[PDB]
Paper text:
KtrAB is a cation channel with a nucleotide-dependent RCK domain. The structure of the KtrAB complex revealed a homodimeric membrane protein (KtrB) assembled with a cytosolic RCK octameric ring, formed by the KtrA protein. KtrA binds nucleotides, ATP or ADP. ATP binding induces the adoption of a square-conformation by the octameric ring and increased K+ flux activity through KtrAB; ADP binding results in a non-square conformation and decreased flux.
We introduced the single-point mutations R16A, R16K, A80P and E125Q in KtrA and tested their impact in the complementation assay. However, and contrary to our predictions, none of the R16 mutations had an impact on the growth phenotype, while E125Q resulted in an apparently inactive KtrAB. Crystal structures of the mutants that did not rescue the TK2420 growth phenotype (A80P and E125Q) reveal a different picture. The ATP-bound structures do not adopt a square conformation, displaying L1/L2 distances for A80P (at 3.9 Å resolution) of 52/23 Å and for E125Q (at 4.1 Å resolution and with two different half-rings in the asymmetric unit) of 34/30 Å and 42/27 Å. In contrast, mutants that do not rescue growth (A80P and E125Q) also do not adopt the square conformation in the ATP-bound structures. In contrast, in the maps for the E125Q-ATP structure we do not observe obvious changes in the main-chain trace that might explain the impact of the mutation in the conformation of the ring. Overall, these structural results reveal that E125 coordinates Mg2+ at the intra-dimer interface. Mutation to glutamine likely affects the coordination of the Mg2+ binding site, changing the stability of the square conformation and explaining the inability of the E125Q KtrA mutant to rescue the TK2420 phenotype. Next, we removed the chemical groups that coordinate Mg2+ in the R16K and WT-ATP structures by substituting ATP for ADP or mutating E125 to a glutamine and measured flux. Relative to KtrAB-ATP with Mg2+, flux was 14-fold and 24-fold slower for KtrAB-ADP and KtrAE125QB-ATP with Mg2+, respectively. To explore the possibility that choline is an activator we analyzed the impact of the E125Q mutation and of ADP in the presence of 150 mM choline. Both KtrAE125QB-ATP and KtrAB-ADP display low ion flux, with rates that are 12- and 16-fold slower than for KtrAB-ATP.
Residue numbers in the entry:
A (entry chain B), B (entry chain A), G (entry chain B), H (entry chain A): 6 to 222
C (entry chain H), D (entry chain G), E (entry chain G), F (entry chain H): 6 to 140
Write the structure that this text describes.
Amino acid sequence: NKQFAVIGLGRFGGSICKELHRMGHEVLAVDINEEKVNAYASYATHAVIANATEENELLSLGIRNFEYVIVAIGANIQASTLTTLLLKELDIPNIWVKAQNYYHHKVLEKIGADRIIHPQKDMGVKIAQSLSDENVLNYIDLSDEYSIVELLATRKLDSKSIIDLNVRAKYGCTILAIKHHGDICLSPAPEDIIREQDCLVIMGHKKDIKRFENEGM
Amino acid sequence: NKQFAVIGLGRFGGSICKELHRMGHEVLAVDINEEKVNAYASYATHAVIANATEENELLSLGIRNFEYVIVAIGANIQASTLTTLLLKELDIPNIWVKAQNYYHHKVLEKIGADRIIHPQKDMGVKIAQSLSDENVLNYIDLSDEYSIVELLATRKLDSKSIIDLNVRAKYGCTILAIKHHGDICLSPAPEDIIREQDCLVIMGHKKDIKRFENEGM
Amino acid sequence: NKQFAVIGLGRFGGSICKELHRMGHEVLAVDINEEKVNAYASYATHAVIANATEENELLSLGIRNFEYVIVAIGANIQASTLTTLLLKELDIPNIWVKAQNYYHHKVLEKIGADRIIHPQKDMGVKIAQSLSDEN
Amino acid sequence: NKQFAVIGLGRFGGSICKELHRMGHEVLAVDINEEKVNAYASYATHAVIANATEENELLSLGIRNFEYVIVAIGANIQASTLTTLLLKELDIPNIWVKAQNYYHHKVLEKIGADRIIHPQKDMGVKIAQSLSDEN
Amino acid sequence: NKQFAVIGLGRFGGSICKELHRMGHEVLAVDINEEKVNAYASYATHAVIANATEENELLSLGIRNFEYVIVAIGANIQASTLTTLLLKELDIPNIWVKAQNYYHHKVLEKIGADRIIHPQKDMGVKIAQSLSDEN
Amino acid sequence: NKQFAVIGLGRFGGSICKELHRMGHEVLAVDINEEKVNAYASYATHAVIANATEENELLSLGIRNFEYVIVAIGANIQASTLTTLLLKELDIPNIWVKAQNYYHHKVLEKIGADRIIHPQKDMGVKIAQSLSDEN
Amino acid sequence: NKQFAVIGLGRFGGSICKELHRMGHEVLAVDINEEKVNAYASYATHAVIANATEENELLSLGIRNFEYVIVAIGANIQASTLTTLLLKELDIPNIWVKAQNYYHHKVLEKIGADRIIHPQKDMGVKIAQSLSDENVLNYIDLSDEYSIVELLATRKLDSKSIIDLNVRAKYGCTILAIKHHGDICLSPAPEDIIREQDCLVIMGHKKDIKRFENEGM
Amino acid sequence: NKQFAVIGLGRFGGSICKELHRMGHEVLAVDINEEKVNAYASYATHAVIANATEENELLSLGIRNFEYVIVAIGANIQASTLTTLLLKELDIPNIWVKAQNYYHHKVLEKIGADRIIHPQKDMGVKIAQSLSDENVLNYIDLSDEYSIVELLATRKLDSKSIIDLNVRAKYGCTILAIKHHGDICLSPAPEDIIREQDCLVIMGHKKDIKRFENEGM
Ligand SMILES: Nc1ncnc2c1ncn2[C@@H]1O[C@H](COP(=O)(O)OP(=O)(O)OP(=O)(O)O)[C@@H](O)[C@H]1O
Ligand SMILES: Nc1ncnc2c1ncn2[C@@H]1O[C@H](COP(=O)(O)OP(=O)(O)OP(=O)(O)O)[C@@H](O)[C@H]1O
Ligand SMILES: Nc1ncnc2c1ncn2[C@@H]1O[C@H](COP(=O)(O)OP(=O)(O)OP(=O)(O)O)[C@@H](O)[C@H]1O
Ligand SMILES: Nc1ncnc2c1ncn2[C@@H]1O[C@H](COP(=O)(O)OP(=O)(O)OP(=O)(O)O)[C@@H](O)[C@H]1O
Ligand SMILES: Nc1ncnc2c1ncn2[C@@H]1O[C@H](COP(=O)(O)OP(=O)(O)OP(=O)(O)O)[C@@H](O)[C@H]1O
Ligand SMILES: Nc1ncnc2c1ncn2[C@@H]1O[C@H](COP(=O)(O)OP(=O)(O)OP(=O)(O)O)[C@@H](O)[C@H]1O
Ligand SMILES: Nc1ncnc2c1ncn2[C@@H]1O[C@H](COP(=O)(O)OP(=O)(O)OP(=O)(O)O)[C@@H](O)[C@H]1O
Ligand SMILES: Nc1ncnc2c1ncn2[C@@H]1O[C@H](COP(=O)(O)OP(=O)(O)OP(=O)(O)O)[C@@H](O)[C@H]1O
């Protein structure tokens, strides 16, 4: 199918490998720690003990073969950098590397990493958003002003109809989906009911959605 | 407004504090490392050097007053645990704690943490998804089967109309938004054009969207 | 007869193991320190070197079989806690744990220890009783 | 009534002092750690900050007057030994000392401790008894 | 004449600065260690305390003006790399960097160092030559 | 031909050993770090793991036989000094030692090193010469 | 002859063992460090690796047999104390122990050490004496006021006769010995010559000897 | 008077400083350990916290002024050596240094130490001598063969006269002093009595004195 190499079986890397394997892709799980290799042996096609900074070992893995190589080492800067460098000289098409700090990001950038990821930082932003605002479950920003938001229904919204909550006119926003007890209703008709604790998917302007949150729920 | 305490100014915690401060909330940034306190001094209301495991220091902070306290210590299990326990005994309403592994999650759960977060793991799942599928830019899962997906337009979609790409009947999915050169089109009419490299927002069943990705783009 | 597991062969744990062995019960003496295992080899049925916080080692001991498991680690809070949690998830009937301080007691309590003991403290109470009353 | 000196306000020593105080005996609570003195101030007749290994401080306490002196220092062997020694040379009638291990027990024995206690070991025996017999 | 910037006043860098100064070139001696700046104050045109990894400080030095910049930091790999990088993005014509090991050489190479020097290795070759031939 | 001993397989020492071996001289490569010995195994006649400060090991190497011994340890002053002293007492004809700073140079001088080298410093002089004069 | 056990082959203990062996006495050199046993193997009757704090090893040495046992462990207080204790319970006649500090001295005293020695302290006193007074080579105090002193002859005393330096009347002191180029003259007659740099042995009152040092040499 | 610097307030150095101070000399007590400085504050003219290996601190002490500087650091070879070298370059007249082993002695020698002392070794020799021979209390060697010895009187010597014990003819040795109950008799006449447990001071050849010990006492 497509070949993936996950170097460094941390929480982040390990999650990558496990999830990728669940999708049924060819995933090579590489780690210097034997116990890590033993741990993710069930969740990969091939799990190998290797020092990714050692070139001959990298050739012994046959890493040149892979379309995507992921350096999920984000604590040991030298290891990460060196590995990424090795992969670059070996003409790997896509090199995605986990970064620790802004400067590690810089060195990864300059030695030609294709994509650099900061997991804890970004998730930090997200959880912070959820922190200042206990309401929102999830969201995606379409632009600086417009956004699609996933909301947890409160005791203002139980047994209320879509026509009752006229968001399309009163607030200029549109409801896209309702999730009730795992069951899912896409682009629901105005007769449909929202029960409390259900997932509600609204779409519109940020300030408008906030308005609806305030007076509506 | 509402009072927030961020204990542990790492990447995750630090991001929390910085972002929260950008929203204009009262954020107390607490850390045992002096340099961390000095670093986030600009991005908080009050930045204090404190050992969060030391109770008298915790009273010196006056943490009982705060609605939300965040333990963003995820490397030092003992520190995190001890701190969370301290906060619980001090009757803090909402305690959100960063966890490292499944068992640290367990002990946090058992000592009554209100919300436990695994940043690297979750972000790992996400980036893994982006890894197996170079196309998807972003997404949100409405349920186990249904999802809203943001897609990067290829040359197969250039100069194509919404009515030309009949997703609502042929694939059972619905287009929600088109982002062209930063400009944004919400719930676009069938006459609208999609140019390549633009952001496309489709909504529907996972496999159906996959199907559309396959034959359409 | 009845199966007992004593994890942590200190003075306290070691005393438990030695005494129980004197009563003729099946006692598994577990310790990470090799010299401890060697020391109480005579005073147990089976004495094993194991890291009780490592799950696979805990399965290698076959601890699920035991009716009573005693965590006599009272200096290393993290070890004690982690181990107790491991035993709880492994559905051990009776988990008795040695505690150091009030908060270690709290975390043991919350992760569902069946009995928590403070040996030195209680002994303080006892010796005080003996002091007030020489009889 | 009878005068007791408790040197070292740990869990064990602290328990001794607190309990003896509940039974209404004259108990002098001595500790080098100020916060310990502050903690047991409510549970003693006189609570003093003192380095029990320093002789002049021991004379400043007026320890020669006391019938019973209890050395509840069981982590710091040197401190325990030295203190016990000071008390012995000062002709104290009854010196009861908390011991850590068999050899600290030995040195306490040889410098003439009147009663040596091993809290964790003995309590180990007890809790083991409680284990074999849930009643 | 020609402008030289020597970042890192070690033995190697310091020698560069001192000697260049003896030949009468405009040499800016930069160091984070104040005492190093004080030491080579006599042997430079301008000696400045600066963190060469901090960009705003690098602009405060006005390093863009210089034809040659020498990174004589060879113990602190991160500092060396970061500084060299800063200089590269600032379009410096000639960047000569002291390297520690083969891989630091590699990263310097990839971030586009113009000349990389290994003092101990090369000098090793030389002294070896002097050994085989005493003349 | 002529026998050379290179103690300390760094970049500098390693360079000496490698180059000398390329010239086809009998070179004994000695290092306390096993991986170093393994690294320069191809570039020497005999590569041995040895603690050069330990005299009996130095006799086990049979270092008295060698005309030239090179101490290429320039980070660990104590090791360098102690080794040089050992070699001097063992009546080695030519002892060339890598030095770190002026005082290490002084102590090497006083314990009678035959030649003291400062590689990085001198290299500083050289690169400065090359900078002033691009030709 | 007489049997000696030297436990702990340090500089002090090692010197004891070596010197004792030079006198031709039966010396058992005991140490836990193998290399120490190997080092003093030539300078003892029997050199054994043993943990002197372990009782069964002490019986394996047969230490009960020895008239004198010397604990020359002065860094490791616990080891020293414990060993001394072991020897005491085993009814060793003479136990001489090296001490580190005043309190280690105390515990050794109370567990019944027969002789306690402080080498560095005493030698410290001596070298200090030599420090304030560059003249005196050696001495022995007969009492608070009276002493026998060994002096290094200066350029005041060369080619001077004993009758010339009338110490017995002018200073009340008496010359006992003259050491010239290793050759030795005991209780010398008044005709004898003292050459410079020779050893001179005077006897008398301290202040008087000082007087002679001042005006005489 | 004369100025002394004692660097390193150990047992040896500390004893030096204390004793020197008792003699009423100007003694500068230098140590890197603050508590050591605090301890010997009473027993010196000036007690200073200083790193003796740091040159600028050594100039801050003004050590160039002192006639005698003593390096009593004998555990930390590097510190001792570096310090001694510093003092030498600073043209100090007399540098006396405590040594640990033969090679530390060698390096001190080569960097031009004026006097090198081995306290534990020498005291070891002495105590060893007292060990093989329970009789000798003290002694001084005049040469390889001749010596002055202080002896503890046994019951064989009780109530015996100097003329009764004819050492001057029978053994070729001469009695110099008798110490009875603290009272002291210098160069005693032949009528004088020696009572047991008294101090006896004999002078002569080593083996001759040994002979007298054997048959006499
Ligand atoms: N040079 C190397 N070669 C191969 N594997 C390595 C190398 N260096 C580190 N690893 C492995 O990569 C993994 C990276 O995790 P690390 O300990 O760096 O923390 P992290 O990746 O930031 O945390 P996590 O990924 O668990 O959130 C480690 O488990 C480690 O065993
Ligand atoms: N006992 C403690 N009391 C107060 N602060 C602490 C304590 N222990 C750690 N911290 C601080 O909390 C922060 C937590 O970051 P840590 O070094 O644990 O990595 P992390 O938080 O897992 O990673 P990230 O930087 O992504 O958050 C650190 O900056 C540390 O200084
Ligand atoms: N993680 C662990 N796994 C296995 N054994 C352990 C672990 N931690 C400690 N132990 C062992 O448990 C024993 C407990 O003794 P410890 O040193 O904790 O003193 P204590 O238990 O507080 O007091 P006592 O010695 O009277 O029991 C020790 O001998 C130690 O070797
Ligand atoms: N030399 C000393 N002089 C006076 N007090 C001391 C001295 N050394 C220790 N202490 C005090 O005596 C107390 C003895 O407790 P320690 O820390 O020795 O543990 P412990 O007593 O064995 O534990 P527990 O709390 O179970 O009794 C301590 O609180 C300490 O402050
Ligand atoms: N980030 C930095 N910014 C500015 N100056 C630095 C930085 N890092 C190190 N320096 C300075 O540069 C100098 C480089 O010397 P360093 O300590 O790295 O040893 P070196 O240069 O390899 O040794 P040598 O003296 O042989 O050159 C040091 O004096 C240090 O103070
Ligand atoms: N006491 C010792 N005995 C034997 N080998 C040693 C000893 N000390 C250091 N070495 C070895 O000598 C080599 C010297 O390299 P070091 O790490 O000292 O850098 P350097 O010599 O200053 O610079 P370079 O690496 O360029 O020679 C090291 O590889 C080290 O393993
Ligand atoms: N428990 C023990 N059993 C046997 N030998 C021991 C024991 N502990 C220490 N030793 C040995 O006794 C010797 C005592 O020397 P230590 O290291 O204590 O310094 P020291 O005796 O004060 O110094 P020195 O005697 O060299 O002047 C050491 O060489 C050590 O190997
Ligand atoms: N670099 C240094 N600069 C200044 N003082 C030092 C330095 N290193 C050690 N000292 C001090 O010198 C003293 C030397 O004693 P050390 O601990 O070396 O044992 P020692 O002198 O061999 O034993 P003793 O107590 O018998 O003299 C110590 O008290 C220490 O604090």
